[PDB]
């Protein structure tokens, strides 16, 4: 009310409006869904379009050969903070041969977007991030929110109407963590989680994006006619 | 740009079946002066890596810091610290690279030689060198200083090729490091009786060995030696 | 007063066949009188069917390929997975040697692949940047011995068919990949009698349509 | 006052939504993509009989292979030209070839939120850009000041927006030939316009493989236009 | 932030106005009135000293009069420490073209620059403008006498004869009507005079409440002479008018 | 640094600093551009509201920014000072760069451009200055007239004018001037000019200046009675 | 660049310059003309180390040039020295030096008098009859000594400057391939074509 | 190098050698000393190869974008001032490039020489490198500006072939270029080895040399 004018102003209540206010714009945006298990970690994401002469709006993007994420709200924020996420990999594969933890990438983003958030003149990021990736500890699945808490989870869901794939992953907890040594099988698992999020609007060939990574497994988005396959 | 002052000599090691093994004298030279003589030149990080280094000891004594910070600053929010991402002697050894090249193009090098010796996760032995220019290479033997000229050959003997490395057990290897050892100290004008010795072993682990001397020497044969050539009393 | 340059020595050589490349370096590393390695690899993958040599000083070459393999990483970032042609490649490293102007990479950079038609390529550098598309080049220590040889029996100079005398040049046939690997081996067996720092083992990096194949041979060990 | 950079309680940045009402308030202009080619084409809307009309440039080169149309405050797109054409020649510069029409509109759209209290607010001005190359053929996008750019088959942007995209939802098909895209552009230009649509208030310009980025002659458009006239006739 | 107290010093009003220029030049209304005057054979600068006291010390005191180098000189009418920030940048400025060019500062350049400086108070920087009007008073061998008048806008123009501060409405007119252009330095003394003598807030205008001073060619041959008048200089003349 | 946002969006899409900036224009005398067939013409007002000036050394409405090309404007005169400044040094800057004198459209799109910056630069606020800017290009005998904005938007005009009271001027030359055949000579396309003015001007006595620029350089100001001349022809012809 | 000589005669200065520019050991150019116009009555001709001559008459000629559209109005030819000479002597302490050696020649319309400058790189200036920069004047001052006349004639002084290149061409070692003549006075700057 | 350039009636002839060095030994036979900025642009190399390259890439880059801001082709003096001014920044730093940038535009033919110091020139002739001496001996004995299109050729031809001979650090072959107002046209690679052998039967030539 008076107390969100800007970022560097708690309310009366211990609230920041500015932070709440991004939070918004990740409700607004488009449903993505996020799960893994011990051997694999998979994205999927409900790309949108302007109008039927506009092309679908990219949702995922790539880190490292090893890690990448899946946005929702603002694009060119995530543009940012993933651009970040590519250097940050790339310092640590250069000055110490090592592939970037991805629960060390999850604190970066964290401390990255909290500065923004104490700060006067800036602002919060207006993005949600689902990271996944493979390393020395296995397969991993985090979520990124621009107040600058970052959890890691076994699955979730971000965007509109996100709550119906949520509560589909929270039932299967225990039949998709135990899908090891088959991708399909796993993508299957998320296209149906994020199937729970739909309404009028339907899976088509140009609307569906999805990506993996996994033991022996690059992180690969899929597209197009490579993605009719789990329709 | 400097100039080296209080200096550390060769640092020697070589690759075993199951490990590596490295060693280095515990001498602080000043110029011709035998000035220092308790300094240890092997410092261990955690229990897969040991680092030797050679040349200018006060840059050594940085570069011990940055290791020993380095070991902090990766147990930071990293609850596999201890396991799965502990650090590994490639990470360290790039690092230090990363340093020693970036210091050469900014014409202020850490004037040192350094040999970093350890025992990857999956088993596999790591033997690499990096020096003040930031050169880097790798070799089933590895040596500094007078050690490149003088120890190698000998330790050459024993492992030539990659083959030879199965063949060879810690035993032998020890053998030939402590032989080696002994003949840097006939023939090296800043070197030292006593030493250090470190095993890294994919089984056993870090074995380090301090206060180490260098016996079984030949002196006897001097009493006959007369003269530099007429002279017979 | 420190040096910041030093010399470790080596040979490489590139050589372009009809719809192939080769890309080949010994695998001795030295300083002075003494050897460092008998196997450090100085020829690399450095993705999209390209391969890279710097050959001269180590610690400059590791460094300028390290940036090259970065500078493809972000190309595929930046441009939607393209794939950067050979062209594309050499233009890009020119840029990356003319940086260090006034401090250079001490190092002979060589290059080899595919072009956009599919033929064979090669790419030479100088040390700060100057760089053009050739059929065959030696770099390194022992690159005035070999370059000679490839003038003669790769373009066929100064080779004039019998019984014309003079009149009628060798014809400039094309050469196939076991052809030109014999013409490495030997190129490479002759520079290690002649040249103290060449010897130890031979890397050959083969590039055709299918991919990146590598050869490994022996050479003299003194 | 409050923030340049604040955030509305529904999540959008105010001076975003608020220069996205300054382009609404633009000349038209309008987009179409074929795999013949990509048409470009404005309302120019003199404001004055005197002001020399062919001194209004709405549509712009970037490179021999990018084309570029702008609707809003078109003061505000001569500092996004210049970063497009010289993104453009310095990529050919460092890799010797033509730049992705893609990179390029993902280079001019960086400057976007480059705003805060950098410029001191947001562009006031949308931008067709249209242009072709090796990987994904002919190719249309849709900058804005947001930072966001969706490729099209079709596109409006301008005062008549939404009434030309209704036009352009119902023409449009993927066998469109360059000769029927350009009486099409010409059509809903026409459709849209306050004065009468003619050589001299309306331009077209196109973008094929062959030929690169053209703007066309008045008197290759009016040529157009009274082809269009008796083809509407006929019927 | 800091935002929530910035007065922003440096915009436009719905009309087109720049606020703080324009209540600058209110501030500058309620001061001293200054007069210029302009003759075929030199000029003249006459100034009013606000309410003074009896135990002012006169004689060493300036308020109104500067002098900026041999040949031009300013009447200042405003907020006196703000005229002398820009004084002695104008001071500076002259000297600069003096080493540059080994010849003295041609009068317009000077008021162009320190106009210019003015200026860009109103454009850029957030702070306030200087609330000072200077008449200029200068000589060069280009276009000989001049006068000239710059305000906290950075707007400056040429003049015959001219005033600054209060009562400048009236004072303009009755310049308007006795000056002429053939006009002698003895006449303007006396028109600057009787000009400040009708349009003074104060009861009589006496010599302690006055500056004056006159830039001639009445010198020995072909030069320009200053003349700060002193306060018995500025008494006799005052007998010499008939006003006192 | 003073960073403060000035030049900013409202809820209706205006950017309300610029616009304001362009009433400062509409307080501005009046300022009209013709071009003829062999020359263009600069007309300006002068208010008589400031008798007692010394018309030798007040600063001129028209200001040359090189030998071939000059500028008047209309609005705030201490910002514009700053644009021909600017224009000026750009000038030298082409001529010593590229060899070349700039084209009267380049100068044009320079000036536009940082009229243009302001508007969307931090701690400052745009110019309450529309320019005219008028030439011929080197070696080339077509004229040239532009205009330009605080917007910093600029276009080529075949005659236009800015200022208080230009609505009425431009309705004038809307009606009087015939693109098929304009002022052939300087004679006509001055007394279009001044006639274009004495429908707003008042008085035609001091209150008009003329300026002429015709090709390769040669660029002269019309005096007073050359001026009165004009103005007397006008008024007795008008009577009938 | 090697050879410029420069003379005041009664109503004009004359200022002579060589045509030679070499690059290693051959002459790339024998018609190069050192000299640039600074305003309409005033002529500043250069020599000195290889680009920077040019580079810093140009500087000087869009700096003055610049001062002349700002004031409607021509500097005098003593104003435009002395802000040369500000220029090199500001120039001699910098990182590096422009090494520049420049002879100004103007006629002054106020006072109705020619005046020639000689202004040395580390900005040592001097008013002069007659002027030269680096070995120049060792050949030709005793001929100058000798028959300069402040009241000569622009042809007379033409007359003189052949004497002094003959002798140039007599006595140096370097072929300087001729000089080109330039004029000036009241009416403005002009070219010696034949010389 | 050896490298020369000049104007005639017909437009401008650009002549080139081929050889590169990094001592005596000989590093490359065959490298390209001309760079095709636009078609009617063009610019010799001469010095340090990797200064060539960059540099006149860079005016190429810089010449493009004036043709899209100004929507005409920039001229010949223009061009040259761009390049001269880069040298001028970089003023004292050690690079070494000498070039000829000959083109054509509304002034008609245009040749300007460039150095490393900042240096340049116009004129109707010019040769750069190690070997120039050689090449303008020839060029001064037969230079007219009536030369045919064929004549010419054939004189910048001989004129690097002059140098070829006698110049050590100049040869392996010659690249020609003429520039007319439809743009440059390039007239081939000739080989040294060969082209001398066919000089000196059909011209009477190179006498004291045995063959
Ligand atoms: C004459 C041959 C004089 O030597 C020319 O001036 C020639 C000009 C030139 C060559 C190639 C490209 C453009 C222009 N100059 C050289 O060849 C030059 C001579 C030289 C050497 C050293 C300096 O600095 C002290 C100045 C001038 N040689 C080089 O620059 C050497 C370093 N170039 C190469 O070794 C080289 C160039 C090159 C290009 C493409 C592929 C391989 C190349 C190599 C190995
Ligand atoms: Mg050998």
Redesign the pocket.
Do not use: I
């Given at each position: 009310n008076n107390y969100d004018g800007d970022t560097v102003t708690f309310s009366p209540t211990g609230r920041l409006f500015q932070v709440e206010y991004a939070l918004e714009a990740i409700k607004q945006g488009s449903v993505t869904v996020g799960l893994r298990s011990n051997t694999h970690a998979v994205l999927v994401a409900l790309k949108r379009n302007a109008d039927e002469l506009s092309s679908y709006q990219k949702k995922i993007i790539k880190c490292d050969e090893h890690m990448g994420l899946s946005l929702a709200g603002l694009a060119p924020d995530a543009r940012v903070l993933s651009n970040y996420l590519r250097q940050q990999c790339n310092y640590s594969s250069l000055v110490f041969n090592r592939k970037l933890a991805v629960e060390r990438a999850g604190h970066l983003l964290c401390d990255k977007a909290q500065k923004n958030t104490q700060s006067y003149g800036g602002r919060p990021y207006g993005v949600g991030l689902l990271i996944i990736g493979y390393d020395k500890s296995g397969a991993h699945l985090l979520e990124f929110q621009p107040s600058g808490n970052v959890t890691e989870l076994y699955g979730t869901a971000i965007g509109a109407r996100s709550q119906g794939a949520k509560t589909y992953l929270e039932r299967t907890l225990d039949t998709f963590i135990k899908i090891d040594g088959n991708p399909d099988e796993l993508i299957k698992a998320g296209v149906e989680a994020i199937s729970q999020s739909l309404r009028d609007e339907s899976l088509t060939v140009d609307n569906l994006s999805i990506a993996i990574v996994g033991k022996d497994t690059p992180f690969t988005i899929y597209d197009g006619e490579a993605v009719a396959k789990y329709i | 740009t400097q100039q080296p002052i209080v200096t550390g000599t060769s640092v020697i090691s070589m690759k075993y079946d199951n490990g590596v093994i490295i060693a280095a004298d515990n001498l602080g030279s000043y110029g011709s002066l035998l000035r220092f003589n308790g300094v240890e030149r092997l410092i261990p990080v955690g229990d897969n890596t040991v680092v030797g280094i050679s040349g200018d000891i006060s840059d050594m004594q940085h570069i011990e810091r940055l290791l020993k910070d380095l070991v902090t600053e990766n147990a930071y929010d990293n609850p596999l610290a201890d396991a799965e991402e502990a650090l590994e002697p490639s990470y360290i050894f790039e690092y230090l690279a990363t340093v020693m090249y970036q210091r050469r193009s900014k014409m202020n090098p850490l004037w040192n030689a350094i040999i970093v010796a350890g025992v990857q996760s999956n088993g596999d032995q790591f033997l690499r060198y990096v020096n003040l220019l930031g050169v880097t290479y790798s070799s089933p033997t590895l040596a500094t200083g007078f050690g490149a000229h003088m120890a190698n050959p000998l330790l050459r003997k024993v492992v030539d090729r990659e083959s030879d490395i199965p063949k060879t057990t810690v035993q032998v290897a020890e053998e030939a490091i402590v032989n080696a050892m002994r003949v840097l100290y006939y023939r090296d004008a800043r070197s030292s009786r006593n030493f250090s010795l470190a095993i890294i072993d994919k089984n056993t682990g870090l074995t380090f060995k301090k206060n180490l001397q260098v016996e079984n020497m030949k002196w006897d044969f001097a009493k006959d030696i007369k003269g530099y050539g007429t002279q017979k009393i | 007063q420190f040096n910041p340059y030093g010399d470790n020595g080596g040979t490489i050589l590139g050589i372009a066949g009809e719809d192939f490349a080769v890309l080949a370096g010994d695998t001795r590393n030295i300083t002075d009188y003494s050897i460092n390695s008998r196997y450090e690899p100085k020829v690399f993958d450095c993705g999209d069917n390209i391969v890279m040599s710097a050959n001269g000083f180590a610690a400059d070459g590791d460094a300028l390929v390290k940036r090259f393999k970065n500078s493809v990483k972000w190309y595929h970032f930046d441009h939607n997975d393209k794939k950067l042609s050979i062209n594309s490649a050499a233009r890009n490293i020119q840029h990356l040697l003319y940086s260090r102007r006034f401090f250079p990479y001490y190092v002979?950079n060589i290059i080899a692949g595919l072009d956009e038609d599919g033929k064979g390529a090669v790419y030479?550098?100088?040390p700060?940047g100057?760089?053009?598309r050739?059929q065959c080049r030696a770099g390194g220590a022992a690159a005035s011995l070999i370059m000679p040889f490839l003038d003669n029996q790769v373009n066929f100079k100064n080779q004039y068919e019998p019984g014309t005398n003079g009149k009628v040049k060798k014809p400039l046939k094309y050469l196939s990949v076991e052809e030109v690997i014999k013409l490495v081996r030997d190129s490479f067996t002759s520079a290690t009698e002649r040249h103290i720092q060449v010897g130890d083992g031979l890397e050959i990096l083969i590039v055709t349509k299918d991919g990146v194949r590598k050869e490994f041979y022996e050479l003299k060990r003194d | 006052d409050r923030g340049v950079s604040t955030f509305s309680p529904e999540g959008r940045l105010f001076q975003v939504e608020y220069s996205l009402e300054a382009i609404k308030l633009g000349s038209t202009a309008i987009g179409i993509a074929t795999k013949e080619g990509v048409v470009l084409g404005v309302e120019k809307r003199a404001t004055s009989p005197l002001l020399e009309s062919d001194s209004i440039e709405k549509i712009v080169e970037i490179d021999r292979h990018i084309g570029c149309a702008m609707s809003g405050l078109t003061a505000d797109a001569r500092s996004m030209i210049e970063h497009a054409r010289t993104a453009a020649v310095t990529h050919n510069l460092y890799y010797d070839e033509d730049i992705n029409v893609e990179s390029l509109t993902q280079s001019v759209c960086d400057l976007a939120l480059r705003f805060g209290e950098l410029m001191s607010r947001p562009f006031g001005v949308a931008l067709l850009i249209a242009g072709h190359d090796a990987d994904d053929g002919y190719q249309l996008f849709h900058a804005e000041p947001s930072g966001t750019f969706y490729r099209y088959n079709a596109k409006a942007i301008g005062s008549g927006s939404e009434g030309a995209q209704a036009e352009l939802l119902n023409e449009w098909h993927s066998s469109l030939t360059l000769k029927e895209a350009e009486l099409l552009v010409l059509k809903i230009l026409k459709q849209v316009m306050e004065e009468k649509l003619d050589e001299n208030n309306a331009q077209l310009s196109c973008i094929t493989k062959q030929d690169g980025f053209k703007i066309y002659d008045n008197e290759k458009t009016a040529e157009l236009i009274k082809e269009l006239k008796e083809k509407e006739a006929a019927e | 932030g800091s935002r929530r107290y910035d007065s922003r010093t440096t915009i436009f009003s719905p009309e087109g106005r720049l606020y703080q220029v324009e209540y600058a030049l209110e501030s500058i209304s309620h001061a001293g009135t200054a007069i210029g005057i302009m003759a075929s054979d030199g000029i003249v600068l006459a100034a009013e000293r606000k309410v003074t006291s009896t135990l002012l010390e006169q004689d060493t005191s300036t308020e109104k009069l500067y002098k900026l180098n041999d040949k031009i000189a300013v009447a200042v009418a405003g907020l006196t420490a703000d005229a002398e920030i820009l004084i002695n940048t104008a001071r500076i400025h002259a000297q600069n073209y003096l080493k540059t060019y080994n010849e003295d500062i041609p009068v317009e350049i000077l008021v162009r620059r320190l106009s210019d400086i003015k200026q860009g108070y109103t454009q850029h920087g957030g702070l306030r403008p200087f609330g000072v009007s200077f008449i200029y008073a200068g000589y060069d061998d280009r276009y000989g006498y001049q006068l000239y008048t710059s305000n906290p806008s950075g707007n400056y123009t040429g003049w015959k004869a001219i005033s600054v501060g209060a009562n400048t409405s009236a004072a303009q007119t009755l310049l308007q009507m006795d000056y002429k252009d053939d006009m002698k330095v003895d006449d303007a003394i006396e028109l600057a005079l009787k000009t400040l003598s009708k349009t003074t807030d104060s009861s009589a205008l006496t010599y302690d409440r006055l500056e004056f001073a006159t830039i001639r060619k009445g010198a020995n041959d072909g030069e320009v002479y200053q003349k700060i008048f002193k306060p018995q200089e500025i008494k006799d003349i005052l007998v010499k008018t008939g006003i006192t | 640094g003073y960073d403060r946002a000035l030049s900013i969006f409202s809820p209706d899409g205006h950017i309300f600093q610029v616009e304001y900036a362009l009433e400062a224009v509409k307080r501005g005398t009046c300022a009209v551009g013709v071009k003829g067939k062999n020359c263009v013409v600069l007309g300006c007002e002068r208010r008589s509201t400031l008798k007692l000036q010394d018309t030798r050394i007040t600063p001129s409405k028209v200001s040359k920014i090189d030998s071939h090309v000059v500028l008047s404007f209309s609005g705030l005169n201490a910002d514009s000072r700053i644009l021909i400044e600017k224009a000026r040094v750009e000038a030298q800057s082409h001529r010593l760069t590229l060899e070349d004198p700039v084209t009267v459209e380049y100068l044009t799109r320079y000036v536009a451009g940082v009229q243009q910056r302001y508007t969307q630069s931090g701690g400052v606020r745009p110019f309450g200055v529309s320019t005219l800017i008028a030439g011929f290009d080197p070696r080339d005998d077509e004229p040239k007239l532009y205009q330009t904005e605080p917007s910093g938007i600029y276009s080529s005009w075949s005659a236009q004018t800015i200022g208080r009271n230009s609505k009425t001027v431009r309705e004038f030359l809307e009606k009087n001037y015939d693109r098929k055949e304009p002022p052939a000579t300087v004679e006509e396309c001055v007394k279009l000019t001044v006639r274009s003015l004495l429908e707003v001007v008042q008085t035609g006595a001091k209150n008009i200046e003329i300026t002429v620029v015709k090709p390769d350089s040669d660029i002269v100001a019309l005096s007073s009675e050359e001026i009165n001349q004009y103005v007397t022809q006008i008024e007795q012809e008008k009577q009938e | 660049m090697d050879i410029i000589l420069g003379i005041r005669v009664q109503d004009s200065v004359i200022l002579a310059s060589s045509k030679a520019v070499t690059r290693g050991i051959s002459v790339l150019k024998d018609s190069d003309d050192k000299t640039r116009q600074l305003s309409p009555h005033t002529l500043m001709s250069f020599a000195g180390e290889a680009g920077d001559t040019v580079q810093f008459a140009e500087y000087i000629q869009a700096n003055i040039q610049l001062y002349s559209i700002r004031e409607d109005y021509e500097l005098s030819p003593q104003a435009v020295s002395s802000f040369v000479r500000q220029e090199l002597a500001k120039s001699i302490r910098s990182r590096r030096p422009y090494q520049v050696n420049v002879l100004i020649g103007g006629y002054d319309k106020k006072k109705n008098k020619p005046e020639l400058y000689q202004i040395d790189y580390l900005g040592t200036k001097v008013e002069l009859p007659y002027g030269a920069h680096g070995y120049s004047g060792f050949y030709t001052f005793s001929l100058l000594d000798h028959h300069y006349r402040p009241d000569m004639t622009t042809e007379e002084g033409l007359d003189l400057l052949k004497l002094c290149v003959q002798e140039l061409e007599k006595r140096m070692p370097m072929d300087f391939k001729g000089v080109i003549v330039k004029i000036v006075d009241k009416d403005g700057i002009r070219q010696v074509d034949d010389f | 190098?050896t490298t020369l350039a000049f104007k005639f009636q017909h437009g401008v002839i650009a002549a080139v050698?081929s050889?590169?060095?990094?001592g005596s030994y000989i590093?490359?036979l065959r490298?390209?000393?001309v760079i095709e900025i636009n078609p009617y642009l063009l610019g010799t190399?001469?010095?340090?190869?990797?200064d060539?390259?960059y540099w006149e890439r860079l005016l190429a880059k810089e010449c493009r974008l004036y043709y899209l801001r100004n929507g005409e082709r920039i001229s010949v003096s223009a061009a040259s001032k761009l390049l001269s001014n880069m040298m001028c920044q970089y003023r004292g730093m050690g690079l070494?490039m000498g070039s000829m940038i000959c083109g054509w535009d509304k002034k008609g033919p245009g040749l300007y020489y460039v150095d490393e110091h900042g240096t340049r020139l116009s004129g109707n002739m010019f040769s750069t490198?190690?070997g120039n001496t050689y090449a303008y001996g020839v060029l001064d004995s037969n230079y007219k500006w009536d030369l045919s299109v064929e004549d010419a050729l054939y004189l910048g031809k001989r004129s690097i072939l002059a140098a070829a001979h006698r110049d050590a650090?100049?040869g392996g072959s010659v690249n020609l270029y003429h520039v007319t107002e439809d743009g440059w046209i390039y007239h081939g690679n000739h080989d040294v080895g060969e082209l001398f052998w066919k000089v000196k039967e059909e011209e009477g030539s190179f006498n004291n040399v045995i063959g």
């Open positions: - | - | 002979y030479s550098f100088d700060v100057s760089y053009q050739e | - | - | - | - | 190098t050698d050889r590169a060095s990094a590093s490359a490298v390209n000393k190399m001469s010095g340090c190869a990797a060539c390259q070494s490198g190690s650090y100049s």
